[PDB]
Amino acid sequence: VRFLDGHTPAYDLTYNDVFVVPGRSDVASRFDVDLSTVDGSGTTIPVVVANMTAVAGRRMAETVARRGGIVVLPQDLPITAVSETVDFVKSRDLVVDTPVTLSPEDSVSDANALLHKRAHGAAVVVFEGRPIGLVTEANCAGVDRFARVRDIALSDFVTAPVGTDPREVFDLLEHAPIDVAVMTAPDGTLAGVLTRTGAIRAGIYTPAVDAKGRLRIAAAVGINGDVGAKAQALAEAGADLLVIDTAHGHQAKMLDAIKAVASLDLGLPLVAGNVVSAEGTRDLIEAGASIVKVGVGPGAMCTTRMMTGVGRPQFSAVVECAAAARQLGGHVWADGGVRHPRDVALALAAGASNVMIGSWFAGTYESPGDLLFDRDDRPYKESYGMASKRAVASSFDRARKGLFEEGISTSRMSLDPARGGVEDLLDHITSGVRSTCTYVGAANLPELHEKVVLGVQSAAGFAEGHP
Amino acid sequence: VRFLDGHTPAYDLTYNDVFVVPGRSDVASRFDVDLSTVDGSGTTIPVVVANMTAVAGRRMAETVARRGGIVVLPQDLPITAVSETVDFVKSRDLVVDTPVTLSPEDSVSDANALLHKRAHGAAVVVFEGRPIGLVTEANCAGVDRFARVRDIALSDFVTAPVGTDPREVFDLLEHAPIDVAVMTAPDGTLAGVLTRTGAIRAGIYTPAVDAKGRLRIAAAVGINGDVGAKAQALAEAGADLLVIDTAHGHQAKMLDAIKAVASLDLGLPLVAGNVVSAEGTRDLIEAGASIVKVGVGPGAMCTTRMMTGVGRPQFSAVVECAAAARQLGGHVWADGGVRHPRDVALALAAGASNVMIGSWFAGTYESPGDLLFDRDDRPYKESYGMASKRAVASSFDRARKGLFEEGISTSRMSLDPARGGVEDLLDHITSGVRSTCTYVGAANLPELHEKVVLGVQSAAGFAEGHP
Amino acid sequence: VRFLDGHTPAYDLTYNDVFVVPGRSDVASRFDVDLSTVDGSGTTIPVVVANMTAVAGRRMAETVARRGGIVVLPQDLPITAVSETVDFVKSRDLVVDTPVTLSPEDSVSDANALLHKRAHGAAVVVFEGRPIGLVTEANCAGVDRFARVRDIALSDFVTAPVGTDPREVFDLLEHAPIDVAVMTAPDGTLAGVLTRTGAIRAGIYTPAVDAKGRLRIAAAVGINGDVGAKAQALAEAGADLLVIDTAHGHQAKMLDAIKAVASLDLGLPLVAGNVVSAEGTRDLIEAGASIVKVGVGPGAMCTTRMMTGVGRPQFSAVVECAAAARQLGGHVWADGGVRHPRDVALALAAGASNVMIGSWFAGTYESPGDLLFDRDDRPYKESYGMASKRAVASSFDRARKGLFEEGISTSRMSLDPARGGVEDLLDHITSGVRSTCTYVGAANLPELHEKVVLGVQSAAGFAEGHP
Ligand SMILES: Nc1nc2c(ncn2[C@@H]2O[C@H](COP(=O)(O)O)[C@@H](O)[C@H]2O)c(=O)[nH]1
Ligand SMILES: Nc1nc2c(ncn2[C@@H]2O[C@H](COP(=O)(O)O)[C@@H](O)[C@H]2O)c(=O)[nH]1
Ligand SMILES: Nc1nc2c(ncn2[C@@H]2O[C@H](COP(=O)(O)O)[C@@H](O)[C@H]2O)c(=O)[nH]1
Ligand SMILES: Nc1nc2c(ncn2[C@@H]2O[C@H](COP(=O)(O)O)[C@@H](O)[C@H]2O)c(=O)[nH]1
Ligand SMILES: Nc1nc2c(ncn2[C@@H]2O[C@H](COP(=O)(O)O)[C@@H](O)[C@H]2O)c(=O)[nH]1
Ligand SMILES: Nc1nc2c(ncn2[C@@H]2O[C@H](COP(=O)(O)O)[C@@H](O)[C@H]2O)c(=O)[nH]1
């Protein structure tokens, strides 16, 4: 990667340690650059939700797939649930988001708890397949918590048939007091709910789809047990992308698993990780892997840095591994150490074809967790690490193995009081990345990597700018 | 008044010191009792807003008059403003509330500041006399504060012609996401805005009107200066009720002013105060006064208790003065010491034909004050005493008089975060009074006075019940 | 009632205002006095759980019935649920408490939430009707929240057949690390769980049973609607005691309802309330009521004192009504104003044949509510008032009635960090009452009423003693 004159430090670079120098730009606006990835995962944005049991669910899968990003299902899940989630995701409209369907016999407490499942801010009360009312935080408040939803003072909704251009739903909702609108099928049955900002995003973002035009989905597999059989079964379950994840991706078990999956000839791209060394990436590439995940330790849920001292500054690892993979022709997605959109922008700047966010999406409306409330009423959610789920494995043996196993770390990921949904944070990330391209002056991600000028940044440098 | 057996205390009774014992009741529901007053002020509810410069304005005047209560304009106001307010109030629809009219050239900051002028929670953007949009706290937030209101994302409103029964506006607004509705004149021009709870109140409350069917209004006059000329001028200005208010209503100046106003033969009922003694009430009645205001010191803005030790427990004073006036045939409105609806209920229980609330309405949306915000974002407003305005009066003389004048007391009257409007607190007061009648078993206020059973209550007794 | 020489106040007496002077005693120990009630409700202790939707459930019903107290089911409940609760209560062992039955397929989160349903502190994992393990707060902590209960490290339990005397289960559990013990049926199926303190209470308390030896239960009915049909249906549902409750028990609707129920000849004792006057009690007695509930306003969830000023100090009302009822031969249970066991002791001292606790049991493990946790981890629960459920009653009519309806008051009732169960607080109340009898020197409640010496107590007097 390009480096500024006189910048020869005797130290590695992390996201906390780097900045990009803007260059001569010909890109007029941020909308003139495309974020389509070259890695072959078929995501139009370089954002993938990590394989978290607390952050990767069907709601995030469908939402991010409609927004143009891949979602990797967490490992150690019964294949029945995997198939159910895949079928649910593949049966989603390409433009309209699936709302919170509410049966008339649901309680007010259940409706209130379900209202925060999505970022729309409203849930649809549907009877016999036809939407009959709308609920929100306003009408729900004050009424008895275990009363039925049939007397929650259903509000009026803007009804339009499926197929209208986003312009029509937008200006129809220009003066609507409620941001959401019920997208209705031609027969009158409810097909989904589309929002004002959703209408805006329908043109900016192009959903990531497979050859059959269905929302792409991914899943993660470990190394313990028969990796080949599990990978083949998940591939038949409908997963578009297969990911092999482990705490240490440079062990011989990783190489054996990658070799087995490559020999399976499943046809899906191969994803392995994580390694923070160039030699590990070359070994994984030679083992039959197309994609190499990088980063062990910088992960916000990773504890091994404090317990063992292992790890690496993320930015130097990602740039070195990306250079090695491009020398071997492979492609790399950065994983770990992501807390701000600048982290994502630098991760693509280092050369990564795609990015792995991780625990940041734990603070979303659609994450598969419980939105509990603190004293200050600030919404937030708890992010968990997998620990043994990314580690290679009788009651005696189980307890003996678990004694030395690192505990499941817990953090309080705060929700934005206004922009709490995954949609607007994704918008922020995409806007930051587009601004990075405009400052560099690149029309696409490969040009962003080629034409970037990269500097080293210290701790005192972050005092510059608004936090 | 009726007193419980064995209750012969050697001490006076205040609102803090009394309770009412329920008796045999024949009134089925609270809606079966009428709150029409006998005092002749023509108010269908026993609530009058005090003569506060910070609490008595045109908005409170019109709102409370439409709700069935009289409003007394504060003294020491230029008669031009008095006439303007009277003309504004007399030109108000009997059912629909006047909204916050917003010209399209107003700024976002002005719109936000005006939105809290009324309890509707929304303001009407009106162009060429026709309403074109609706604004609220939702669309106003986020947009630039000094941007025009023409790009504040006006919302849709429910439009109905003037004359529809409250049932029609109610069920038309049953499923409306916005509580307010634009009441439009037959020609298409805006006539007012009516709310869901306003539609509910349109049947429960009957507005207080004069012989010409216009919202009744009242004004206050002092004793300093020519009382007769000022009273005659305000009567010609359109004030329905004339009130003579002073700190001490038992002085000879009060008697002279009452005699002059009675000799004026203005035709309006005579109101004088305040006296906390029976002999003062008899003197005021003999001076030519029909109504005697009672209470000096219990007022939440009154300071004379702490400065001089003067005053009286309110409840004993009001009951004694009401008994004296009924013996002389006069009628009395209790003034001061009102903080809870139980205070109002006891004030009517003592025998008062009407009640004076005072500083409690300072914590309202419609009060003529500035709604400032604290750290906890709790809305509140400051209540001021008149001081010298209720006291009998060169730079030397002015400063010499002002040195000994009691300072303008200031208090922080908190707004209810949900029920901040004057409408819902008035509803609470009326519900409490109706519950008092139902517990007593009285069909009207005279029966409430006649059939009430009254007990004495100590400090430890208030620990009973939910605060 | 007996009154101390020179005690002729001109003021009523509440629980905050009274104390009992100990007299010449012949009762050696507290265990030598019996708390059997004379009112005919058949409760061996003078404690009844109020008709609260948040405090009266099947768990409280069975627990308090086994402890010797009646439980009144709240009104406005579908008779199907009433019949289900009655059948559940009547099918409870006379000595052993019903534990928290846990299926092996339950999650750790569900087990943790259910563990606080009872005061035992442990839940039984039962498979095919046979208990296979024990869970508590210790083994549940640390393990994954959505893991199955089959791998929660089930502990060992003390197994005994049903029929062993409490001595045997006590000394068998003398050195048991776990207080609870699984009471097993002779065939091996689980019949219940009995605790060490439960074994202790099995001799002190005698469960309240009907003629068929089944745990007695009670239910509450309002006055709106057909009172006779509802009362007859609940009587056929299996309710032992019928209670007619309303906000104002002196209205003509109350008299009509009592007359109808008395004419029904249902055979159950008649309970009506609440009235705080002797004349109301006489009217209710003449209407065909055997029991008169007393107290409106002192209730910790009652708001009418602050809204309307109505009410009465509880102690004077209860003593006067008890004297009137005993003159007419009727019996009275005090209701409202109960926060300490001294309140109960004085309520029986005033002459009440039984006591109504109310919101105090809202802070229990077995109350039908959600045990949420604060920052200080102190357990507590929210107590609600019925409001309109104790008041006499289209969308327009519904909303119009609800506008004037008093809001559902909410309070934070703190749980004792150690003695959080209903069992130990009931023990405290019974110990206080027994101590009161010992200080008076009475062998039973009628002797307690007859031989009591009663004094008046001020606010400064409560500073005596440990709070
Ligand atoms: N009634 C209802 N429940 C829903 C809906 N969407 C999600 N849920 C609830 O959420 C569960 C799945 O949570 P998730 O894995 O999507 O975060 C479902 O099993 C169901 O309980 C909906 O539209 N309606
Ligand atoms: N060793 C280890 N790595 C973890 C754990 N939880 C998450 N990670 C890693 O950290 C990444 C997420 O971190 P983030 O990108 O949110 O900072 C995951 O995708 C995974 O690679 C854990 O418990 N142990
Ligand atoms: N533009 C506008 N200002 C209003 C409206 N109602 C009240 N105001 C503002 O409030 C002032 C009077 O305040 P008030 O005495 O009613 O509390 C007016 O002079 C004006 O500045 C309205 O409908 N539109
Ligand atoms: N002496 C005196 N009385 C006041 C003052 N401000 C208000 N009051 C009295 O107190 C009443 C309002 O008190 P409130 O009814 O709110 O407790 C007024 O109507 C007036 O009679 C003041 O500054 N001085
Ligand atoms: N699995 C299980 N749930 C119980 C048990 N006891 C109570 N519950 C739960 O508590 C509900 C009733 O709550 P309650 O009305 O008893 O407070 C039941 O419907 C069930 O969900 C028990 O022994 N086992
Ligand atoms: N008027 C009224 N009384 C209530 C309300 N909630 C409870 N109560 C009364 O207060 C009693 C409980 O009060 P406690 O005995 O807990 O102080 C109830 O049994 C009932 O008589 C309410 O919302 N309104």
Side-chain angles (χ1 to χ4, degrees):
Chain A
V1 76
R2 196 144 314 288
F3 99 87
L4 264 78
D5 311 3
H7 276 189
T8 56
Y11 180 76
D12 307 330
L13 304 320
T14 180
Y15 303 1
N16 233 329
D17 267 279
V18 286
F19 72 94
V20 47
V21 163
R24 187 168 174 117
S25 169
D26 300 301
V27 193
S29 297
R30 301 186 291 262
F31 285 177
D32 229 7
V33 72
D34 71 297
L35 295 90
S36 295
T37 58
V38 63
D39 53 359
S41 68
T43 174
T44 79
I45 66 187
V47 196
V48 176
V49 194
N51 39 319
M52 293 322 179
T53 59
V55 178
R58 88 207 303 161
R59 294 174 289 132
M60 321 275 268
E62 68 145 295
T63 300
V64 159
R66 193 172 301 111
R67 293 321 171 190
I70 303 290
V71 174
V72 185
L73 262 280
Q75 70 284 0
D76 289 345
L77 317 189
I79 193 134
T80 60
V82 163
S83 180
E84 205 185 326
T85 294
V86 164
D87 296 358
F88 173 86
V89 166
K90 297 302 185 62
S91 62
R92 304 270 68 75
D93 171 82
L94 256 301
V95 175
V96 191
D97 285 2
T98 290
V100 184
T101 62
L102 262 173
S103 150
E105 300 327 295
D106 283 54
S107 65
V108 164
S109 300
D110 193 2
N112 187 13
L114 274 175
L115 202 78
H116 297 298
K117 285 278 195 201
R118 303 273 191 174
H120 317 313
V124 158
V125 184
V126 52
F127 177 77
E128 59 216 341
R130 187 167 300 90
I132 73 170
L134 224 37
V135 311
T136 176
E137 323 83 337
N139 53 347
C140 181
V143 154
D144 160 77
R145 291 64 41 201
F146 47 69
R148 284 298 92 63
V149 82
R150 299 159 317 116
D151 43 340
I152 197 63
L154 301 321
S155 69
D156 298 324
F157 35 73
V158 180
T159 293
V162 173
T164 81
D165 178 277
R167 270 278 260 179
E168 274 73 11
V169 68
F170 193 49
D171 54 11
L172 272 191
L173 281 279
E174 183 72 4
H175 296 349
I178 305 302
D179 191 285
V180 317
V182 284
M183 272 316 326
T184 54
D187 55 4
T189 59
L190 164 75
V193 160
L194 196 142
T195 60
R196 198 172 141 70
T197 168
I200 275 170
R201 277 177 205 109
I204 312 167
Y205 297 117
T206 89
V209 279
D210 45 8
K212 217 139 80 72
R214 283 162 308 119
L215 293 192
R216 288 176 162 245
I217 207 170
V221 62
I223 39 155
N224 39 357
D226 196 359
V227 190
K230 292 181 313 164
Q232 165 298 337
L234 65 82
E236 311 303 321
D240 174 30
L241 295 174
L242 72 83
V243 171
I244 305 99
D245 195 1
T246 174
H248 190 191
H250 207 183
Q251 48 194 304
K253 197 144 177 57
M254 205 53 168
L255 302 193
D256 295 358
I258 298 324
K259 189 212 68 62
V261 178
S263 311
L264 256 186
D265 317 336
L266 267 184
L268 317 178
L270 256 288
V271 174
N274 328 106
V275 279
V276 300
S277 53
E279 60 152 321
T281 54
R282 317 182 284 93
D283 299 3
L284 279 187
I285 290 292
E286 296 158 5
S290 46
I291 301 308
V292 198
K293 287 182 60 191
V294 287
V296 316
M301 269 320 83
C302 194
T303 304
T304 85
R305 303 215 75 249
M306 101 166 187
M307 281 284 168
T308 86
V310 85
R312 190 169 181 184
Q314 183 66 265
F315 194 84
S316 288
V318 292
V319 65
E320 167 182 302
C321 295
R326 274 145 193 280
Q327 164 271 323
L328 318 158
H331 285 173
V332 168
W333 322 335
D335 169 22
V338 181
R339 273 298 297 105
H340 301 144
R342 64 166 290 126
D343 301 359
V344 176
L346 299 154
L348 296 310
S353 55
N354 176 343
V355 163
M356 217 48 50
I357 297 313
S359 66
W360 191 10
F361 288 73
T364 55
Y365 272 117
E366 279 104 330
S367 80
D370 273 328
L371 193 141
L372 164 154
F373 278 140
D374 68 17
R375 240 77 148 165
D376 305 79
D377 271 306
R378 325 210 192 260
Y380 80 119
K381 281 188 171 183
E382 315 63 35
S383 173
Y384 306 158
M386 55 315 294
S388 55
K389 319 320 164 283
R390 268 179 31 112
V392 48
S394 168
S395 172
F396 181 62
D397 317 341
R398 227 190 290 104
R400 182 180 181 239
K401 185 43 215 55
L403 177 88
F404 273 58
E405 186 54 77
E406 30 170 4
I408 299 295
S409 53
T410 309
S411 62
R412 298 192 147 193
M413 291 305 338
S414 294
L415 254 199
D416 212 357
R419 312 275 88 71
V422 70
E423 309 279 20
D424 39 49
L425 295 174
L426 269 188
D427 287 355
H428 301 131
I429 295 162
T430 312
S431 176
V433 175
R434 285 175 175 281
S435 305
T436 315
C437 327
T438 57
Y439 279 118
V440 176
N444 50 71
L445 292 208
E447 305 324 290
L448 177 162
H449 187 198
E450 289 159 55
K451 297 214 283 294
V452 65
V453 193
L454 244 188
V456 55
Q457 173 36 302
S458 63
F462 282 26
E464 286 179 354
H466 192 42
Chain B
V1 76
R2 196 144 314 288
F3 99 87
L4 264 78
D5 311 3
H7 276 189
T8 56
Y11 180 76
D12 308 330
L13 304 320
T14 180
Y15 303 1
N16 233 328
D17 267 279
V18 286
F19 72 94
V20 47
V21 163
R24 187 168 174 117
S25 169
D26 300 301
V27 193
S29 297
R30 301 186 291 262
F31 285 177
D32 229 7
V33 72
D34 71 297
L35 295 90
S36 295
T37 58
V38 63
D39 53 359
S41 68
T43 174
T44 79
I45 66 187
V47 196
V48 176
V49 194
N51 39 319
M52 293 322 179
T53 59
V55 178
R58 88 207 303 161
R59 294 174 289 132
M60 321 275 268
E62 68 145 295
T63 300
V64 159
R66 193 172 301 111
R67 293 321 172 190
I70 303 290
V71 174
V72 185
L73 262 280
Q75 70 284 0
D76 289 345
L77 317 190
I79 193 134
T80 60
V82 163
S83 180
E84 205 185 326
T85 294
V86 164
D87 296 358
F88 173 86
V89 166
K90 297 302 185 62
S91 62
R92 304 270 68 75
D93 171 82
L94 256 301
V95 175
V96 192
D97 285 2
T98 290
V100 184
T101 62
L102 262 173
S103 150
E105 300 327 295
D106 283 54
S107 65
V108 164
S109 300
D110 193 2
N112 187 13
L114 274 175
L115 202 78
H116 297 298
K117 286 278 195 202
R118 303 273 191 174
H120 317 313
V124 158
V125 184
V126 52
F127 177 77
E128 59 216 341
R130 187 167 300 90
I132 73 170
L134 224 37
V135 311
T136 176
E137 323 83 337
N139 53 347
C140 181
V143 154
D144 160 77
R145 291 64 41 201
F146 47 69
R148 284 298 92 63
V149 82
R150 299 159 317 116
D151 43 340
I152 197 63
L154 301 321
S155 69
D156 298 324
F157 35 73
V158 180
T159 293
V162 173
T164 81
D165 178 277
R167 270 278 260 179
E168 274 73 11
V169 68
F170 193 49
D171 54 11
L172 272 191
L173 281 279
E174 183 72 5
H175 296 350
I178 305 302
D179 191 285
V180 317
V182 284
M183 272 316 326
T184 54
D187 55 4
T189 59
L190 164 75
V193 160
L194 196 142
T195 60
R196 198 172 141 70
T197 168
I200 275 170
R201 277 177 205 109
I204 312 167
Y205 297 117
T206 89
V209 279
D210 45 8
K212 217 139 80 72
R214 283 162 308 119
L215 293 192
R216 288 176 162 245
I217 207 170
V221 62
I223 39 155
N224 39 357
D226 196 359
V227 190
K230 292 181 313 164
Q232 165 298 337
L234 65 82
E236 311 303 321
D240 174 30
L241 295 174
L242 72 83
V243 171
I244 305 99
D245 195 1
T246 174
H248 190 191
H250 207 183
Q251 48 194 304
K253 197 144 177 58
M254 205 53 168
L255 302 193
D256 295 358
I258 298 324
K259 189 212 68 62
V261 178
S263 311
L264 256 186
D265 317 336
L266 267 184
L268 317 178
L270 256 288
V271 174
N274 329 106
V275 279
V276 300
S277 53
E279 60 152 321
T281 54
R282 317 182 284 93
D283 299 3
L284 279 187
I285 290 292
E286 296 158 5
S290 46
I291 301 308
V292 198
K293 287 182 60 191
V294 287
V296 316
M301 269 320 83
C302 194
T303 304
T304 85
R305 303 214 75 249
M306 101 166 187
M307 281 284 168
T308 86
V310 85
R312 190 169 181 184
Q314 182 66 265
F315 194 84
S316 288
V318 292
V319 65
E320 167 182 302
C321 295
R326 274 145 193 280
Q327 164 271 323
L328 318 158
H331 285 173
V332 168
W333 322 335
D335 169 22
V338 181
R339 273 298 297 106
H340 301 144
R342 64 166 290 126
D343 301 359
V344 176
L346 299 154
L348 297 310
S353 55
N354 176 343
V355 163
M356 217 48 50
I357 297 313
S359 66
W360 191 10
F361 288 73
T364 55
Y365 272 117
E366 279 104 330
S367 80
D370 273 328
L371 193 141
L372 164 154
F373 278 140
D374 68 17
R375 240 77 148 165
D376 305 79
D377 272 306
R378 325 210 192 260
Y380 80 119
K381 281 188 171 183
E382 315 63 34
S383 173
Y384 306 158
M386 55 315 294
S388 55
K389 319 320 164 284
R390 268 179 31 113
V392 48
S394 168
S395 172
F396 181 62
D397 317 341
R398 227 190 290 104
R400 182 180 181 239
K401 185 43 215 55
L403 177 88
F404 273 58
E405 186 54 77
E406 30 170 4
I408 299 295
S409 53
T410 309
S411 62
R412 298 192 147 193
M413 291 305 338
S414 294
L415 254 199
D416 212 357
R419 312 275 87 71
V422 70
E423 309 279 20
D424 39 49
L425 295 174
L426 269 188
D427 287 355
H428 301 131
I429 295 162
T430 312
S431 176
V433 175
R434 285 175 175 281
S435 305
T436 315
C437 327
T438 57
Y439 279 118
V440 176
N444 50 71
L445 292 208
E447 305 324 290
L448 177 162
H449 187 198
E450 289 159 54
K451 297 214 283 294
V452 65
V453 193
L454 244 188
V456 55
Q457 173 36 302
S458 63
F462 282 26
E464 286 179 354
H466 192 42
Chain C
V1 76
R2 196 144 314 288
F3 99 87
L4 264 78
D5 311 3
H7 276 189
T8 56
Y11 180 76
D12 308 330
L13 304 320
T14 180
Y15 303 1
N16 233 328
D17 267 279
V18 286
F19 72 94
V20 47
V21 163
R24 187 168 174 117
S25 169
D26 300 301
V27 193
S29 297
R30 301 186 291 261
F31 285 177
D32 229 7
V33 72
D34 71 297
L35 295 90
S36 295
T37 58
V38 63
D39 53 359
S41 68
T43 174
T44 79
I45 66 187
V47 196
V48 176
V49 194
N51 39 319
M52 293 322 179
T53 59
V55 178
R58 88 207 303 161
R59 294 174 290 132
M60 321 275 268
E62 68 145 295
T63 300
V64 159
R66 193 172 301 111
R67 293 321 171 190
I70 303 290
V71 174
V72 185
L73 262 280
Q75 70 284 0
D76 289 345
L77 317 190
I79 193 134
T80 60
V82 163
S83 180
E84 205 185 326
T85 294
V86 164
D87 296 358
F88 173 86
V89 166
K90 297 302 185 62
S91 62
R92 304 270 68 75
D93 171 82
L94 256 301
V95 175
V96 192
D97 285 2
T98 290
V100 184
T101 62
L102 262 173
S103 150
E105 300 327 295
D106 283 54
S107 65
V108 164
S109 300
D110 193 2
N112 187 13
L114 274 175
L115 202 78
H116 297 298
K117 286 278 195 201
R118 303 273 191 174
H120 317 313
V124 158
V125 184
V126 52
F127 177 77
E128 59 216 341
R130 187 167 300 90
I132 73 170
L134 224 37
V135 311
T136 176
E137 323 83 337
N139 53 347
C140 181
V143 154
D144 160 77
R145 291 64 41 201
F146 47 69
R148 284 298 92 63
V149 82
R150 299 159 317 116
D151 43 340
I152 197 63
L154 301 321
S155 69
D156 298 324
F157 35 73
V158 180
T159 293
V162 173
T164 81
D165 178 277
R167 270 278 260 179
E168 274 73 11
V169 68
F170 193 49
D171 54 11
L172 272 191
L173 281 279
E174 183 72 4
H175 296 350
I178 305 302
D179 191 285
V180 317
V182 284
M183 272 316 326
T184 54
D187 55 4
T189 59
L190 164 75
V193 160
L194 196 142
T195 60
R196 198 172 141 70
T197 168
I200 275 170
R201 277 177 205 109
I204 312 167
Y205 297 117
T206 89
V209 279
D210 45 8
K212 217 139 79 72
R214 283 162 308 119
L215 293 192
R216 287 176 162 245
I217 207 170
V221 62
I223 39 155
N224 40 357
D226 196 359
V227 190
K230 292 181 313 164
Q232 165 298 337
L234 65 82
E236 311 303 321
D240 174 30
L241 295 174
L242 72 83
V243 171
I244 305 99
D245 195 1
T246 174
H248 190 191
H250 207 183
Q251 48 194 304
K253 197 144 177 57
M254 205 53 168
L255 302 193
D256 296 358
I258 298 324
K259 189 212 68 62
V261 178
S263 311
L264 256 186
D265 317 336
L266 268 184
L268 317 178
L270 256 288
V271 174
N274 328 106
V275 279
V276 300
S277 53
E279 60 152 321
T281 54
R282 317 182 284 93
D283 299 3
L284 279 187
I285 290 292
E286 296 158 5
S290 46
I291 301 308
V292 198
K293 287 182 60 191
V294 287
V296 316
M301 269 320 83
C302 194
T303 304
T304 85
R305 303 214 75 249
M306 101 166 187
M307 281 284 168
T308 86
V310 85
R312 190 169 181 184
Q314 183 66 265
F315 194 84
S316 288
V318 292
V319 65
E320 167 182 302
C321 295
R326 274 145 193 280
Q327 164 271 323
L328 318 158
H331 285 173
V332 168
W333 322 335
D335 169 22
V338 181
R339 273 298 297 106
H340 301 144
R342 64 166 290 126
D343 301 359
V344 176
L346 299 154
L348 296 310
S353 55
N354 176 343
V355 163
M356 217 48 50
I357 297 313
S359 66
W360 191 10
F361 288 73
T364 55
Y365 272 117
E366 279 104 330
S367 80
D370 273 328
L371 193 141
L372 164 153
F373 278 140
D374 68 17
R375 240 77 148 165
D376 305 79
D377 271 306
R378 325 210 192 260
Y380 80 119
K381 281 188 171 183
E382 315 63 34
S383 173
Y384 306 158
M386 55 315 294
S388 55
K389 319 320 164 283
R390 268 179 31 113
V392 48
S394 168
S395 172
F396 181 62
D397 317 341
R398 227 190 290 104
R400 182 180 181 239
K401 185 43 215 55
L403 177 88
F404 273 58
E405 186 54 77
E406 30 170 4
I408 299 295
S409 53
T410 309
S411 62
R412 298 192 147 193
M413 291 305 338
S414 294
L415 254 199
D416 212 357
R419 312 275 87 71
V422 70
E423 309 279 20
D424 39 49
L425 295 174
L426 269 188
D427 287 356
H428 301 131
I429 295 162
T430 312
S431 176
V433 175
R434 285 175 175 281
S435 305
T436 315
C437 327
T438 57
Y439 279 118
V440 176
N444 50 71
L445 292 208
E447 305 324 290
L448 177 162
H449 187 198
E450 289 159 54
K451 297 214 283 294
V452 65
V453 193
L454 244 188
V456 55
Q457 173 36 302
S458 63
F462 282 26
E464 286 179 354
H466 192 42

